């Protein structure tokens, strides 16, 4: 069994009372440190199950939110310990 990245993002937003604006703004310092861009439009496509994140944007969002990258991809693993 597994889930998808859209469900994982929705779990984050329910656990921590976040909206997409919070996710995107929390990511800004990480986008600069890692050299990985994420736009408002792209993040909405991930939450609405229109596209899956590529390798670089999983890494960005897993570091931003402090969660396992395998978990954020939708595998049935622990939320925190990969990377």
Residue numbers in the entry: 1 to 81, 83 to 84
Which lines from the publication concern this structure?
The TP901-1 switch is encoded by a < 1 kb fragment of the phage genome, including genes for the CI repressor and a Mor (modulator of repression) antirepressor (transcribed from the PR and PL promotors, respectively) instead of Cro. As for phage λ, CI in TP901-1 contains a DNA-binding, N-terminal domain (CI-NTD), which consists of a characteristic helix-turn-helix (HTH) structure. Cooperative binding of the TP901-1 CI dimer to OL ensures maintenance of the lysogenic, immune state, and inhibition of expression of lytic genes and mor. Structural evidence from a CI-NTD:Mor complex and a CI-NTD:DNA complex strongly suggests that it functions as an antirepressor by steric hindrance, preventing binding of CI-NTD monomers in a dimer to adjacent half-sites on OL.
However, none of the uncomplexed structures of CI-NTD corresponded to the identical sequence of the construct used for the interaction studies with Mor, which motivated a new crystallization effort. The new X-ray structure, which has by far the highest resolution for a TP901-1 CI-NTD structure obtained so far, resembles the overall previous structures of TP901-1 CI-NTD with the typical HTH motif. Generally, the structure is of high quality. It was determined at a maximum resolution of 1.29 Å with a final R factor of 14.97% and R free of 18.29%. However, several exposed side chains have alternate conformations (Met1, Ser6, Gln11, Ile12, Met13, Glu15, Ile23, Ser41, Ser44, Ile58, Glu69, Met73, Met79, and Val80) or are not fully visible in the electron density maps. However, there was definite disordered electron density beyond this point, which, after many attempts, was modeled as res 81 connected to the rest of the chain and two additional residues (83-84) after a one-residue gap. As modeled, the positions of res 81 and the res 83-84 segment are not compatible with each other, but each represents one of presumably multiple conformations assumed by the chain in this area. Gln55, Glu69, and Met73 (underlined in the sequences above) stand out as interface residues taking on different conformations in different crystal structures. In the most recent high-resolution structure, there are no such interactions and two conformations were necessary for adequate modeling of the side chain. An omit map where Glu69 was modeled as Ala clearly indicates that the Glu69 side chain density would clash with Phe67 of Mor in the complex; thus, a considerable rearrangement is required on complex formation. Instead, the most notable rearrangement upon complex formation is Glu69, which forms an unusual interaction with the aromatic ring of Phe67 in Mor through its aliphatic chain.
